[PDB]
Amino acid sequence: GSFRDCADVYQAGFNKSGIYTIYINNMPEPKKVFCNMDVNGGGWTVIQHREDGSLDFQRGWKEYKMGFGNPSGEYWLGNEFIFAITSQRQYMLRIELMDWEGNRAYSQYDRFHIGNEKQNYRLYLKGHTGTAGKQSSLILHGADFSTKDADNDNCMCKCALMLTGGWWFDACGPSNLNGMFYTAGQNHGKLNGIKWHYFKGPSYSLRSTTMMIRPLDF
């Protein structure tokens, strides 16, 4: 009952990566999450994981709000949970990426939060670093969340319909880790794939993604 996130779990002396139950006031109910305790001192709450395309990401606003998938595998925490957590104090966002050639890279943001649902879960990002490009593949400067059934993007076009999934699409911007999963034999020349432009470019679909958050002050 006292664990608000994976940083609480780690700080209590649990150092093993795996599935934990967290809860914070303002969340609607408890949430099972994967805690990554391995990367740069641990205490990471996973908000997104992909590795095999078993879980479809072509989902509407409501499913992107409440979360989908199972934390033993591929999942999306849900914007309402991301909002509830990142509301409470300053979180940092880390993004683990692997291509199909065995190269691991990461993007990290010192400050991450999102707006509430009436602010379309708008993305706020500051302080990008990492090995996944000098420039941020996520727009830092103000993109709403969009889905196939909610076009909130910065485009006259419908980025979610063109690229698939739910993302902070710009017009349509240099990322979508919630695009279509392509296998090693299909990973090239895909505009609607799992993409991080400043790592592997705009046409390359990545092998695995983990988006994870912890307190800036951890």
UniProtKB/Swiss-Prot annotation:
Keyword Transcription part of the UniProt annotation: no
Subcellular location as annotated: Secreted
PTM comment: Glycosylated.
UniProt keyword annotations, A-Z: Angiogenesis, Coiled coil, Developmental protein, Differentiation, Disease variant, Disulfide bond, Glycoprotein, Secreted, Signal
Organism domain of life: Eukaryota
Disulfide cysteine pairs (residue numbers): 6-35, 159-172
GO term, biological process aspect, one: heparin proteoglycan biosynthetic process
Principal location listed in the UniProt entry: secreted
Note: It may have a potential therapeutic utility since it can be used for specifically targeting tumor vasculature or for promoting angiogenic processes in certain organs such as an ischemic heart.
Listed name of the protein: Angiopoietin-1
Source organism of the structure: Homo sapiens (Human)
